[PDB]
Amino acid sequence: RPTFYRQELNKTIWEVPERYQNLSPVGSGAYGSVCAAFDTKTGHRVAVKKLSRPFQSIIHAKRTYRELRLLKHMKHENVIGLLDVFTPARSLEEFNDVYLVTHLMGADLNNIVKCQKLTDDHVQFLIYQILRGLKYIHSADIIHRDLKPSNLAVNEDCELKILDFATRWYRAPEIMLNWMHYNQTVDIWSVGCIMAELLTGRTLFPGTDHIDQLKLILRLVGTPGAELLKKISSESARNYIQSLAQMPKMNFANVFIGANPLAVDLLEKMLVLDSDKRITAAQALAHAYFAQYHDPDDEPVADPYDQSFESRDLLIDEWKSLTYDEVISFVPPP
């Protein structure tokens, strides 16, 4: 065990190991408080998240459990990774505080896009990276479900990481109105929306309340086919579309004027309404748009992820301890 040093930042008290220094309150929210720091034992500016009240409920206890397990699992250059996790508590009884440490990743795709206009190579490199970790994440049989610019962290070297799994603007149609027939391919719709933004600086489907969200979408890809329509769910959902005036699919070449041809072809493959026709991360990696960067040997996959615990229903005591277990069985990276 190291040596912690207490201190008080913005009405919350931070107790952290000697190695983390220069804590600077970057913000907070429901999830918890986060301080920007400097890890003398690594040279990295880092982000320390103080998780408080992680066990003030079953829903919360489990949630805290989930995030931690999930975070301990991902080990990929393009996915948020846990540099450290600790607790000043010494006994499972004095335990009720969790601190997560990760590379302080400056900026986010949102900030970047709103600041400057990127070159095609930038867009290409950024999206290559999203796809690379998306391939990894999907390997472990995990769906992100909330992929959006604000969830994409980018440093000065244009390296990107995907973070913790308006949101409606990037949600895929299937999981849009709430249908129990979604899958990994739901994240590709998002990447398509994102790529479109990178390429034009304009939100593709800025819908007001998701009714029009579907209208806006349909307005581009076109109203369903004959069988395609018979490939869906819901009662309402089904009717609305027929309740709409049949619109024809636009030719992306006219929507994304002056854009790289291989780009619009890729979008053509991601922004497909039939999730079963939608290209995979792996398949997208190989598209001609990523030629210079595609290296199959340099595109790792995860190991299965035990989502088993998910099923079980336990009590705060259980989940809490179960979390202490993870907090202790933690092996730093090297």
């Binding site: 206009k117 070297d157 244009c158 390296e159 340099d298």
Partner: protein, 130 residues
């Protein structure tokens, strides 16, 4: 090896210029005609230290009929933010990575002394902006 901000100015009006500063800095402003190169990040360095790809190879994708003319059909200038004494440049610095990769392809590059920061003393009219 090293060229002067002045020599480049004139050299310009009528050579390939590579900017190896951070992408956001490059997008904020670069010497007109300068082409950007991502090389410092892990993936770039890796695949470079593996021939998977090479700088000169990369920038050979901005044509329409022939992809090399005007490319290796000119001397290559290279610049960063401000490296004054190029002779001494760490192996991590982007400047180092490019130079090694180009030289590894039998190409003699020329580094602009004092990078972009210098070149802007009396050449602001030779730059793009926002």
């Amino acid at each position: 090896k090293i060229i002067y901000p002045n020599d480049l100015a004139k050299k310009m009006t009528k050579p390939v210029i590579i900017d190896c500063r951070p992408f956001m800095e490059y997008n904020k402003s670069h010497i007109q005609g300068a082409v950007h190169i991502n090389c410092a990040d892990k993936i770039s360095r890796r695949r470079l230290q593996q021939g998977k790809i090479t700088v000169l190879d990369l920038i050979s994708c901005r044509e329409g009929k022939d992809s090399f003319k005007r490319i290796f059909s000119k001397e290559i200038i290279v610049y960063d933010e401000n490296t004054n004494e190029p002779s001494r440049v760490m192996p991590s610095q982007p400047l180092h990575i490019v130079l090694e990769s180009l030289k590894r392809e039998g190409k003699e590059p020329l580094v602009l002394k004092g990078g972009l920061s210098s070149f802007k003393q009396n050449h602001e009219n030779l730059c793009d902006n926002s």
